[PDB]
Amino acid sequence: PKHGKRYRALLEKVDPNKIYTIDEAAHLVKELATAKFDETVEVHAKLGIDPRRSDQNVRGTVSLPHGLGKQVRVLAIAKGEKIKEAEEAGADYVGGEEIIQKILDGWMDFDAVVATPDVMGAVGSKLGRILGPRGLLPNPKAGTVGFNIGEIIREIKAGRIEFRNDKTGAIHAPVGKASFPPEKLADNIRAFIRALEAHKPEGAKGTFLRSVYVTTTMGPSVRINPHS
Amino acid sequence: MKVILLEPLENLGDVGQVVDVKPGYARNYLLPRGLAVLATESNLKALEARIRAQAKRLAERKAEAERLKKILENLTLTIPVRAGETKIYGSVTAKDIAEALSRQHGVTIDPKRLALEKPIKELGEYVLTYKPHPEVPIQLKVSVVAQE
Amino acid sequence: MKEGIHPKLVPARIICGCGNVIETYSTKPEIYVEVCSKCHPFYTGQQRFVDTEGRVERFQRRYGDSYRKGR
RNA sequence: GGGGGCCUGACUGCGAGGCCUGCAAGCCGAGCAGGGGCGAAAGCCGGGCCUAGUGAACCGGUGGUCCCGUGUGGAAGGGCC
RNA sequence: CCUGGUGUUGGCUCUUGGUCGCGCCUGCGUAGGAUAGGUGGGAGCCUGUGAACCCCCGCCUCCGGGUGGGGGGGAGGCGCC
RNA sequence: CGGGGGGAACCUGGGGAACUGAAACAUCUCAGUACCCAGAGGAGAGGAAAGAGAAAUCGACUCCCUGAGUAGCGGCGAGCG
RNA sequence: GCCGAGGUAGCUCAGUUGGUAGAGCAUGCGACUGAAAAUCGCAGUGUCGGCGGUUCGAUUCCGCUCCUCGGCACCA
């Protein structure tokens, strides 16, 4: 009973028997793993739903009210001052129907698409074709369409994350920084607690937030109790 | 079904138990017999009757044991042997101890429980280990010498 | 009288019905049973001292005969 | 009656008063108020060109209500739409 | 009358199925060094093999190969790129 | 030492019915009625509250009037009450 | 109305990553068939009952919908 991971020391730190609580989690994670740089600790969990009927395929976003400037690239598709507002705020990819055109040709360097209502027809119908069957098309009920382009990418770089559940039923997201202030990490674990509880479709019946854990990139695995 | 055991331990393993033998099962199957009874403040009492009983009996054993333990570990036991400056002609049998101490000095102890691999005939004396009760072993100064 | 109980009396009566529900799930029941019935217990024994029996009925039975098990 | 533009009154609360009528039926309705909709507007629109496309009462369901609850705060249940 | 459950209707043992908990192994359409099961976090990882060179063995099949151990030892390999 | 066998109507408990009504007739009504029975009497019946009741209130049982034919029971039908 | 069930080419059966489809039998052409059937070779040959949908992609995965068959409680 021994495995292949010098992780051995750190795992020794671990000890799966008590799914404990948030702040504890911030601290133990923080101590747990600063490999070659500082851990990109994160949170992962699963929900008692069932995507075979998208009536619960959840996603949205809780703005971890803490600094950033990375993750899931985004294209701000609009016109003039919206391009201003958006790129400004903090947009990886920025433009209008010419950037969309680039997409038609062969460019979707943007995982997510945030288009304002001044190019929504062009985005959704030009790129309806291109971005529809994947999920990279701005949708007026999918955190992807809004005149608030600057506010939007603003968040994208000041402190963004967002949600989305993968196949079988789980969600993946960053709820704090490794070495980051523990209490803080708690603040974010919660940010997620809330936003999630929110997104949580009404097609539930029992244990919804089934397993909620603070775990790290390449590091430890600690189940947690985001109730307290 | 508070089944009280007379001769049971899930076999004739007697008193010392009470288990559940489901309805009739228990009834006429496991206790009609001559192997047990059932609850009753009466039977429970029974358990108390001899639990107490034995608690006092054993307690006692302990006690009388103690009186002898003390008297004997206290006193010395000298015996009139006959012979040369080593082993007497026909040994010191710890039973020799037994009756000699018994009625020439006062208290008796059965031969058996003592500490005598081979009778000892060296003479002189040794204080040895003879356990009058198995948690309480009585040691004592046994001297025999040629009154030749 | 040849089968009340012995460890008291359980020997009789009753009129019994029947229909077909749907009450608090859909509509009214359905009733058409002006019927009549029996309804009873059972018998057994043990020994005073080589020689005995019992007779008796069911429950009141069982713990009862136990009572005489006390004596 | 043939075509085209916009639009839903194929409205609620209501209807004075008349048609046949023993019953309950069924039938016609100016105008009043909120509220729209067609016209610029004199106004017309509470279904269709009309007479047949039909069923009391019960029991029970469902979308409101937020009236009653058997002590009382509830609730099952319950009354009305 | 036949007919599950259940009550008196107790013992010993052979046994096979579902379900939840934990553990293991598992995913080969084509491009893909290559049998990519998902979706995360993510350029770093490791030295009880001093090495991916070779050795057998245990295991799962759709050629290869994936995986888990024992051994042979003299700073390399692999992930990133 | 007692019972038993009686006794017109009366009483308690056991068991327990069609007509007829519902202008049919099956829940229902006639009814817990007629009838078979056991049993106490001179009367049996019931008889100090796990009662009634919502005001911090009554207080065994029985019977007469009243309480309502209301509260209500129900092919919410005949009716019952 | 409930649940188990059948529905694709002329006849009738097939797949749980779905992600690539028919097959046995008739129909067309060609050898063996000196006749024939039978045989073999080939071809032709299709929405997997309807629609969207989870779905890069699933017709077998998600929900509702036709006509159907088997067994249950509906109108009192």
Residues C61 and C5: beta-carbon distance below 8 Å: yes
Residues B79 and B144: beta-carbon distance below 8 Å: yes
Largest CA distance in chain B: 79
Q: Is residue A72 domain-shared with residue A122, that is, in the same domain?
A: yes
Q: Around Cβ B35, how many Cβ atoms within 10 Å?
A: 15
Chain G nucleotides close to protein (CB under 7 A) are: 53-58, 61-63, 73-76
**C-alpha to C-alpha distance for A141 and A156, rounded to whole angstroms:** 18
- Rounded to the nearest 10°, the torsion over CA A169, A173, A179, A181 is -100
List C-alpha distances in Å: A171 to A9, A56, A59, C44: 28, 12, 8, 67
Q: Is residue A73 domain-shared with residue A131, that is, in the same domain?
A: yes
Length of chain B as a residue count:
148
**C-alpha to C-alpha distance for C22 and C28, rounded to whole angstroms:** 6
Q: How many C-alpha atoms does A119 have within 13 Å on its Cβ side?
A: 29
Q: Is residue A22 domain-shared with residue A46, that is, in the same domain?
A: yes
Q: Is residue A128 domain-shared with residue A190, that is, in the same domain?
A: no
Interface-testing mutation among C61, C67, C69, with chain B (most B C-beta atoms within 10 A): C69
B38/C69 touch (CB, cutoff 8 Å), yes or no:
yes
CA A221 to the chain's CA centroid: 19
**C-alpha to C-alpha distance for B80 and B68, rounded to whole angstroms:** 23
B32/C46 touch (CB, cutoff 8 Å), yes or no:
yes
Residues A103 and A95: beta-carbon distance below 8 Å: no
Nearest CA in chain B to C67: B40
DSSP SS3 for B129 = strand
**C-alpha to C-alpha distance for C7 and C63, rounded to whole angstroms:** 9
Is residue A202 one of the residues assigned to a domain?
yes
C70/B42 touch (CB, cutoff 8 Å), yes or no:
yes
Is residue A151 one of the residues assigned to a domain?
yes
Q: How many C-alpha atoms does B70 have within 13 Å on its Cβ side?
A: 6
Would strands A74-77 and A112-115 be described as parallel, antiparallel, or unpaired? parallel
Q: Is residue A29 domain-shared with residue A95, that is, in the same domain?
A: no
B40/C46 touch (CB, cutoff 8 Å), yes or no:
no
Residues B83 and B119: beta-carbon distance below 8 Å: no
SS3 letters across chain A? CCCCCCCHHHHHHCCCCCCCCHHHHHHHHHHHCCCCCCCCCEEEEEECCCHHHCCCCCCCCCCCCCCCCCCCCEEEECCHHHHHHHHHHHCCEEECHHHHHHHHHHCCCCCEEEECCCCHHHHHHHCHHHHCCCCCCCCCCCCCECCCHHHHHHHHHHHCCCCCEECCCEEEECCCCCCCCHHHHHHHHHHHHHHHHHHCCCCCCCCCEEEEEEECCCCCEEECCCCC
- State which of A159, A190, A217 marks the end of a domain: A159
- Establish if B38 touches chain C: CB-CB under 8 angstroms: yes
Q: Is residue A155 domain-shared with residue A91, that is, in the same domain?
A: yes
Q: Is residue A192 domain-shared with residue A145, that is, in the same domain?
A: no
Is residue A143 one of the residues assigned to a domain?
yes
| Count: domains in chain A | 2
Residue C19 DSSP label: B
Is residue A19 one of the residues assigned to a domain?
yes
**C-alpha to C-alpha distance for A41 and A61, rounded to whole angstroms:** 18
**C-alpha to C-alpha distance for A48 and A32, rounded to whole angstroms:** 29
The answer to whether C66 is a known ligand-binding residue is no
Q: Which helix (H) or strand (E) holds B49?
A: helix B40-74
Is residue A6 one of the residues assigned to a domain?
no
Q: Is residue A87 domain-shared with residue A142, that is, in the same domain?
A: yes
Place of tokens 């101490």: B101
DSSP SS3 for B135 = coil
**Which domain does A110 fall in, by range?**
67-159
Residues A90 and A152: beta-carbon distance below 8 Å: no
Q: Which helix (H) or strand (E) holds B22?
A: none
Residues A153 and A87: beta-carbon distance below 8 Å: yes
CATH of residue A29: 3.30.190.20
- Rounded to the nearest 10°, the torsion over CA A180, A183, A186, A191 is -90
Residues C30 and C21: beta-carbon distance below 8 Å: yes
CATH of residue A144: 3.40.50.790
Is residue A22 one of the residues assigned to a domain?
yes
A contact chains, 3+ CB pairs < 8 A: none
Is residue A100 one of the residues assigned to a domain?
yes
Q: Is residue A77 domain-shared with residue A151, that is, in the same domain?
A: yes
- State which of A132, A159, A186 marks the end of a domain: A159
- Establish if B108 touches chain C: CB-CB under 8 angstroms: no
**C-alpha to C-alpha distance for A90 and A69, rounded to whole angstroms:** 8
A216 CB contacts (<8 Å, ≥6 apart)? A29, A32, A33, A39, A40, A41, A42, A178
**C-alpha to C-alpha distance for B140 and C1, rounded to whole angstroms:** 83
AA letter at A115: A
Burial degree of A191 (CB within 10 A; 0-12, 13-18, 19+): buried
Chain E nucleotides close to protein (CB under 7 A) are: 7-11, 37-48, 68-69
Q: Is residue A58 domain-shared with residue A164, that is, in the same domain?
A: yes
Is residue A91 one of the residues assigned to a domain?
yes
**C-alpha to C-alpha distance for C11 and A109, rounded to whole angstroms:** 89
Nearest CA in chain B to C47: B32
Q: Is residue A119 domain-shared with residue A73, that is, in the same domain?
A: yes
Q: Is residue A148 domain-shared with residue A125, that is, in the same domain?
A: yes
A151 token code pair: 């506010």
The answer to whether C30 is a known ligand-binding residue is no
As a whole number of Å, the CA-based R_g of chain C is 20
- State which of A159, A185, A213 marks the end of a domain: A159
**C-alpha to C-alpha distance for B91 and B66, rounded to whole angstroms:** 30
Q: Around Cβ B138, how many Cβ atoms within 10 Å?
A: 20
